[PDB]
Every structure is written in C-alpha cells, then in structure tokens.
Copies of this chain bind each other. A is one copy, B any other.
Amino acid sequence: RINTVRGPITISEAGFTLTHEHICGSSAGFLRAWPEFFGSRAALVEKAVRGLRRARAAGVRTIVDVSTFDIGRDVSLLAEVSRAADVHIVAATGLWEDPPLSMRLRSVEELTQFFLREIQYGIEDTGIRAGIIKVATNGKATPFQELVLRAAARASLATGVPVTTHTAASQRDGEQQAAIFESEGLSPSRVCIGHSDDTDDLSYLTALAARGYLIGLDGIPHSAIGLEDNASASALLGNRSWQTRALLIKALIDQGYMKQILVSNDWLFGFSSYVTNIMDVMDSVNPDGMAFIPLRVIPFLREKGVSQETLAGITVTNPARFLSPTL
C-alpha cells in the first residue's frame, strides 16, 4: 500500500499514473517568502487545479510529485491541490541538483535518517509520508551526490519505497548511478533512471533496461523547437521534437522492454528555479499541461501500432508494481 498526500491507498486505486510531475519548480522557502513571484499563492493554486482537472478529465488518477526539499515541496499546497481536483498525489523525499549548506555538510549516516524521517515518520509537522526517493546527477557524481545515492539506497532498503533519479542522459549518467546503487545491494527493479528520453543512444537504454532497471521517458513534451529566438528556453528544453522522444517508447517496447517503461511529462505550473517568465514560454508550447500524455502521446502511439493492452500495462501496471513497497 502506497502513501499519498491525502493518506494511504491500495495498489489498484491508482489507475493511469504519471510518474514524474511537479506542481511548482522552486527552491526551499521561496514559495512562502516571495509568493508575489507567482502572482499570489492562490493565483498559482488555481493554475494547478485548472491544469490537474484537465488531466483528470483525461483519465489521470495519480501523479507522483518528485519535487524534493531543495525544490520547495510545499506538502500542504500539494494536498490542497489534490482535494480540489480529485487526483492522488504521491510526494517525494530526497535531494535534487541544488542542496543547501545545511544539507551538503551532512554524512551519509545523517542523510539516511532524514530520508527515513520523510518516509517512515512524516514530511515536516504535517504527518504526510513520501512514497518515492528522488536523487540527481549531471555527469560524474560529486562526492556529495555520491553520498545521496548511497543514503537513498540504504533508505530504499529499510522501507521498500523506490528511487527515481535525475540524469543528464547524453553522458550515460545512469551507468554510474546503477554502479553506485548496486554497490549498496539495491535491486534494479527499485530504481527508475529518469530524464532518459533526453538521449538518442538506444543501446545505453536497453543495456540499462536489461540489467533490470526502469526507464523514465519522463520528458515527452520538452521541446524548444519554435523557440529558436529564446536562448534560455532552448537550453532547458532541447532541440529534439516531442515525437522523437515519443517514438523511443515504441522502440523500447520493440526490444522487449515494455515491462520496464514509465512515461510522464515533467511538467509544472510554477517555475522559479530558472529565468523569469520561463513558465510563460513553456505554457505556449504545451497548453495541455500534464494532460499531454493522455491527449497527444497515447493517440500518437496507437497511430504507430501500440495496442491499448500494452499501453495500459505501461501506464497502470508498471507504476503499480513500481510504487508498491517491497522488502
């Protein structure tokens, strides 16, 4: 049984499940401290609930919100949005690209206790528990990032919740990640290598798939084609098309790794950890928001020969098996 922000639910209550989404991409404390940045706090919470409603109209029953502490995971703001839309939300624990000083100077012993705090006891005074552990690298692991992986693996072994990881896929990051993970004795089935549609090296994915790992093609609408005037927007979203990412799903089923795909949008309704008005530009690319998966990518795949049977396994069965704890 899975922990959501509104309590525990059973495996089959989950349904069609986006497995890497954000409500707001921010920093810790930024939302409390400068909420005019997003218009107002209520201005943003409306923007999420409009956008979540649109996906729940499209069949989505659960999102996994992989914002960690250093992304500003306002776990109350989540459960606010989760009532008003009737979408389960699974919150995350862990650490992203930007930990603060009070994190960086901790030992792998200390980080393991904090990770188990938010899985076993609760995120802040709020009593909500996290069902997934997010971690991150961009290239070679820094010594701290190395600690984070081992602490998240030692956490994932006392609790059974899985690990999802941020990756710069162009530099075969999952390889080092999985090397570090397996050194701690974590089953490759308890780990999704994320941001993996950012590469075109299929051999790297299928090699990683074949050791047992789950592959996050969680970036399907991230494309800055049409924004070759925005320098920063092109940097954040890559020059590969959405169909280019989407086809890598079919290509990975073809190698007989349907059992191992998770698909998601990596969308967000507030974005402060990048240049200003980046959210202005991203919403014009993709008005559908988080609804881009059931409205545009599921039709596109049925148009390329993927039946409703295996689509339903990827969107319902795979996240169900992946989020259920396992000792």
Contacts and interface: CB of A to CB of B under 8 A. Distances in A.
Nearest to A125: B32
A25 to B, nearest CB: 9
A322 interface: no
A307 interface: no
Contacts of A114: 33-34
A272 interface: yes
A16 interface: no
A70 B105 contact: no
A13 interface: no
A110 B28 contact: no
Nearest to A93: B33
Interface stretch (A95-103, A167-175, A258-266, A286-294): A95-103
B98 A101 contact: yes
Given A34-B114, A36-B117, A273 B70 contact: no
A238 interface: no
A98 B98 CA distance: 11
Interface of A: 26-30, 32-34, 36-37, 69-70, 72, 97-98, 100-103, 105-107, 110, 113-114, 117, 123-125, 272-276
